[PDB]
Design an enzyme around this catalytic site. Structure first.
Site, PDB file in Angstrom:
ATOM      1  N   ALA A  50       1.448   0.495   2.406  1.00 39.91           N
ATOM      2  CA  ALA A  50       2.803   0.026   1.538  1.00 39.91           C
ATOM      3  C   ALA A  50       3.203  -1.269   2.062  1.00 39.91           C
ATOM      4  O   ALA A  50       2.550  -1.990   2.771  1.00 39.91           O
ATOM      5  CB  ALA A  50       3.832   1.014   1.939  1.00 39.91           C
ATOM      6  N   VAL A 101       5.377  -4.805   1.638  1.00 37.62           N
ATOM      7  CA  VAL A 101       6.644  -5.728   1.929  1.00 37.62           C
ATOM      8  C   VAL A 101       7.264  -6.036   0.537  1.00 37.62           C
ATOM      9  O   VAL A 101       6.477  -6.056  -0.448  1.00 37.62           O
ATOM     10  CB  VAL A 101       6.374  -6.853   2.599  1.00 37.62           C
ATOM     11  N   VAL A 120       0.039  -2.582   6.486  1.00 37.98           N
ATOM     12  CA  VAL A 120       1.277  -3.402   6.002  1.00 37.98           C
ATOM     13  C   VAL A 120       0.458  -4.354   4.767  1.00 37.98           C
ATOM     14  O   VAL A 120       0.025  -5.194   5.125  1.00 37.98           O
ATOM     15  CB  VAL A 120       2.158  -4.216   6.676  1.00 37.98           C
ATOM     16  N   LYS A 121       1.021  -3.973   3.457  1.00 39.23           N
ATOM     17  CA  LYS A 121       0.470  -4.894   2.696  1.00 39.23           C
ATOM     18  C   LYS A 121       1.366  -6.249   2.175  1.00 39.23           C
ATOM     19  O   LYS A 121       2.614  -6.129   2.125  1.00 39.23           O
ATOM     20  CB  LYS A 121       0.400  -4.173   1.202  1.00 39.23           C
ATOM     21  N   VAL A 122       0.713  -7.301   2.138  1.00 40.42           N
ATOM     22  CA  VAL A 122       1.355  -8.545   2.158  1.00 40.42           C
ATOM     23  C   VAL A 122       0.805  -9.454   0.893  1.00 40.42           C
ATOM     24  O   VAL A 122      -0.393  -9.894   0.937  1.00 40.42           O
ATOM     25  CB  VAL A 122       1.177  -9.436   3.499  1.00 40.42           C
TER      26      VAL A 122
END
EC number: 4.1.2.-
Lengths: 220, 220, 220, 220, 220, 220, 220, 220, 220
Positions: free
Chosen positions: G58, G60, G84-86
């Site tokens: 998912a 940020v 965490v996807k950035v």
């Protein structure tokens, strides 16, 4: 890489084995026929002509699997560690499987297609000999066949080697070597052509003329 | 490389296993339909006709995951080490996952696309069988699909092998082999064509004639 | 582009000639043998069956060039505008030259190599027929042979057309067409597969369902 | 090059024809079904929405050649110059030859392979429409099919044009144009993406900013 | 081939028109803004700087199609033969069609994709201008876009020319030219790099030194 | 194709013009310097040495466009139809445009880049002379440059010809001819190498011995 | 190879996890928004739908690197081992470095170029996600971008994997797999398409028919 | 893979070292001169700006091998572990051999040719820096040079890394990375373009807008 | 990789061994004759000239294998670790086999063909020296022969290295290196061109100019 001569001409083999780095000589039924000597005379002569170093190859004549195994045992009784050449036919393939179980090394010969040759190696053949120039002469591509066969052996029967054969010009031999063939066998005419070049002779003459002109002799 | 025959013809398996280096036999529902013998008769016969060595393959008939698992168990009761073929549909993939958890080896069959086949391997299938000639006949490229699938397996599910199937001509088989397929299955007609060549017969005959004209016979 | 069917099946030809845009029908001795009817019966039947228009092809049986010319005349007395197929052998080429002189159109058949096919065209043949699947089956490349031959005709005998024949799968026919062949002849099974696709039937079904769902019927 | 929209949405056609250089509109039974208006209502509306210029295409529903011809006559009664789309099946090819003779222009649709499409052009079709995304989605290569098809038409039926259809992304349409397709039909979503890019918008805004910074306004 | 400078630097254009074989000058809103003189001042100055010969280009500012037509008329009233640059947006394509009908030559600009460019040409644009460096800088391939665009124009809108633009290095311009672009426009810095080379200067220097050495002089 | 020698060596011109089919001779300021004769002596000498036919080229020395035009007029007064070589620099381009306006044929020389070469052609130059070996020697690809330049000229300045120059080996010249150069100029050493081969000498020798052995002489 | 579904549809994930060999699920802000449930609800549900196994992803939302690090913590507090996807912007890269130092695995997303993607890997990211169809839609080449990125990662950041995203057709997914992507995430419609083929269903139906005709039922 | 900034801008190195995963900073004499601060001020400042980790590079100024060794000592006394940039000239090579013996690590700079680059590696250099845009601007191919140079290092001096430099556009950098360059240095303008894309910004915006419409805000 | 100079010029070797990373020096009869000093003088001079390190090569002169072994011993009595160059003719191959038996390292020279060179390596040679420029001059491809030869050695005699020779331009040397030759020998003129470039000098000069303008001097 194993370099063979494709001949039954004993004097020539003796002469050329001093010059080429030979692994051996290969024979087939037409080559023995043209030399007119029987197998139990010519194979020992060929063995001696290379000073006892140098493998021999020779071909069965029988038409059934069983018959081919018998021819193999007779060849082996003439030359203890000779590689037996079996044409890759139905009965030939069966013979290769049997000879594999007996521990008698084989070469699958008369190969006109890559798949045909791959089968011979899967059956136990240690060498596979495509007839490059026969393929070339009959409207095919000897070089694509050899290229395809080498790739197939390396992927699917990696202990088997291609021994490329049937040559009318060194270009064919060169192309087989560039395709990666681990063994090759040359007739006498192609092998002599492969080490004799007018341009090389001219370069040597020139080296000799420049040395002569500067030191007044052609020797060191 | 594992060479298979794609057939339910017991007598023909017996005669040919003496010639080809078979790893075993594959069957599908059509091929079994054609032999008219039920599974519990024909599979044991095929097992025997190759001397108890080499894998057998056979296919489920059910349409649901659970039904396919039950079919697999029925097949394993007939031949304890048989490989179970499962069509790569939605329920098929579910079944393949289930059988993987049960420790039962599978083959993803009826593969008309490379992604489809890769899914079957990621789900646990040990073999993936694209239908080469079906893809060719229906306007695609059988050989492109195979080429792609082999690559996808080697990169992404490297424990799985391509088992190329569905053939009308040896060329198709050659091209699958050239593309790296680690296994293949051949119908009887294509296999017979792969070992019988007029050019090879003519080469053998020439060897015989030459031997005859020199020595007076065609033996030894 | 001239599309032919390769068959002696009269009922099939009539039925298929309303579907396919045929230039005609090709026959050969094996095809005729299999239909069981002699030439003087089938050939007219085939001419009528296709509408009384389009070309027929049929083959000499004789071994000498003079014999082949006799056969050409026997064929012409059955079908006056027939194209005479002549196998491209030595005698075959001599017969092609004689027939060119007589103003009788020929096809050079039983072509297994590109140069061989070019010789028939240079001798006078209007069509040249490589046996694509025979070359494929025997370890060569039927498509490369066809590709080379078409190139050779365009460069060197531009009045001659390739007529590709001997097929086991639509892919081979596609590849011949992609290589430029200006004519081709299909056996019935390959032809039927060329117009029958599961994916196509499913598209058309979906169109029918959607129309159904919106207008309460399946007609226009 | 003829650019078509693949839609039965009249409001949209009228809006988009002001922007795109359209040659017309294509329809199919699913596209007509989705719009819920019958043919005699929507085809004249579509013809008007594009200013009474440019071609319309619509598809037969019948299953027999004879029925498809009657369907064609009905469509022509509605739009006198309409091109009639015929699915390229056996009965479809028979219908295309019949419409050739009646002087009614056809398009061969539901093409999933190149040979198939070419037959339709040899039968008389003026356009051939491969279903690109359908081929892509079902494991083939839509682009290769189109690339092959266009070649076949240029070589073997040069009067016919590929009309590429079935798109989920602009890349597909792009590749069809690069393969040389002389016409194409785009669904509304793909067509809109073809003319709207963030990078372009950002370039246009930058121009406006720089302009404003120098001259105190964004006009002139 | 039409070679342009992309600038509003009137002094530089006068000096360089003497050296380069120019077809004219291109401008855009950023370039005009950077020069700080308004359109009704620079354009006639640029026109004069080239001896009253050579085409000019300048760009519309409005965001609606109708507004862009009016901009086009304003520009034409300043330079009567000016070619009008229109960004290839939805409204831009609309505008291009209307200007085609007025007989006002146009160029489609802000092209970041091949298909986008083709549309402007199909709408009526005589030139199409991909923003090469912009495409390169934003993680694509400006040269790929250009190559594709030219091919697309030559096949599908053959009266239209590519006018490649947006360069940071002479290599980009060279590649555009090798791709076939029938026109191009260089910024001043890249154009000056295209004619000044250390290796050229050293070759000229060398020629001079040899002449000195033999004749005691560097003039003829 | 126009083949030139690159030299001021009159003895060599006289000898080789008998043998090669020359279109003329090229000179550059280094070649003249090395001959040590002034232009009004050597240029008429070279002209006479080739039979009073064929083209001469000589190069300007001035550094300004006007100076270069003067140098051009002097050269023409020495040899009335001489082609004037202009180094392709900023001033050189200006001078080429001027000489175009005077009707004096020019060549663009000291070309170390394809785009630089092209500009000279666009300005009016009839020949463009890249320095192949200088590019090679300095870490580029002279052949790639030549290949590129010939294509640029053929696409964009089709009236102009590449005249390839600066060679240390015949392979370089060969590759320029293979790239399509419509003219070339060879220094003496390379030109001589291009007609003298040991392998050719050996073939002629062999022809002589065979003739001798059969007819007891080497004359016809 | 890790196969993922790109969805917030909990029910579908549960259903499809029985069929596909999933490694997990990916989400992005649009996907979460569409399903309407907030993160603290949907994420644990999706985790449960996969039976506690398989990775989740998912994204940020914050503008600043410090803000993104915070968002990364709120996400880890919901799913302990979530990746965490950035978005790969300037601030995103700053954040990727910080989270790499803190031992929190990340994925660089919203990648439209290969260089951009590589940067995210060098900064720490374990996965890189090019948006394939977005690049195709906007006139680039999604597949080339992907091919380049994979090569870039394997050469320069071998611990990072490509996770290809944004698909409208199975062909796109396939081409990503062929370029070597070690992970992929598919929307539901593309994944469903990837396992449903008319040609496959027709092969299965025919197996059933043949079995029926021989044994009088469709069951094993 | 080692990423460097090519700059003497201290403020800029501080901000961007937070963003990019820098391995350090490179300088040359023109870059140092533009910053107007002497070596002994700016080098410690760049060191501090990257935070005390990060390799620095700087270049010698002397013309002889001996002087270049003294320059190296002075550089090393400012930054103990700095890598010393030496131009690859005759005297530079000699310096590189001396500096190898002293155990002082070198970078061979001002490389405009592959062979030149290699020589510097063979002499002892750890890095080799081709001037990519200079080669491009002067009519060569910078990318070809880099591609060749990398291959030469990996084949012949595998300790040495290519450090690509001189860029005007990101595409040039992308292409150096695809060619396998193990390090690279970017000017500031090209680095900033490599992380800022309109298409990316627009993707981020859309994610924000979608999140808004579902949860009344843009934050997590 | 071993870099040699091909020369007998002692003073030049002393000067150049300080610049180039030399592994040694190669001689041949024409090179020794050009220097006019006898072997027993020049060889110790050359060995000293490179500071007593680095390998030497010299050539036999005798026409017979026996003689060539004797020359080898003379050569070895002058320099103890010298590599003996033998021309690859019949007698030369015989000599090489004998020398392998004596433990004396050899190089096969006057190689004008790939297969010829492989034979010398198979006979026992450690180095094989193709005459690149001689092959190029005489109408072949020097690069193709080297490319092929290196492949042959690497597949078939992997202990042997290509030592490429006979160069008229740096391009030829570059291409042999790109083909992967593990050793090379450069004549003095070509070697100097490889380290002297106008572009480089101009880049260094620009570095000094920028440096002077900022710091009031050209030194550090």
């Amino acid at each position: 890489h194993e370099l063979y001569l494709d001949t039954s001409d004993v004097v020539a083999v003796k002469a050329l084995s001093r010059i080429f780095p030979l692994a051996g000589v290969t024979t087939n039924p037409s080559i023995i026929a043209a030399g007119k000597k029987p197998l139990d005379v010519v194979l020992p002569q060929l063995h001696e002509a290379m000073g006892g170093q140098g493998r021999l190859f020779a071909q069965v004549m029988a038409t059934t699997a069983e018959g081919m195994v018998n021819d193999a045992l007779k060849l082996r009784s003439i030359i203890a560690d000779i590689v037996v050449k079996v044409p890759v036919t139905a009965e030939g393939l069966a013979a290769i499987k049997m000879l594999k179980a007996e521990g008698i090394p084989t070469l699958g010969t008369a190969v006109y297609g890559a798949a045909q040759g791959l089968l011979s190696a899967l059956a136990g053949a240690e060498y596979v000999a495509p007839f490059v120039n026969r393929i070339d002469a009959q409207g095919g591509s000897g070089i694509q066949t050899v290229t395809d066969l080498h790739q197939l052996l390396k992927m699917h029967a990696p202990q088997a080697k291609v021994l490329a054969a049937s040559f009318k010009t060194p270009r064919q031999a060169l192309d087989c070597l560039l395709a990666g063939c681990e063994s090759i066998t040359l007739p006498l005419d192609v092998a002599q052509q492969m080490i004799s070049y007018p341009a090389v002779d001219a370069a040597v003459a020139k080296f000799e003329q420049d040395w002569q002109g500067a030191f007044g002799r052609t020797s060191i």
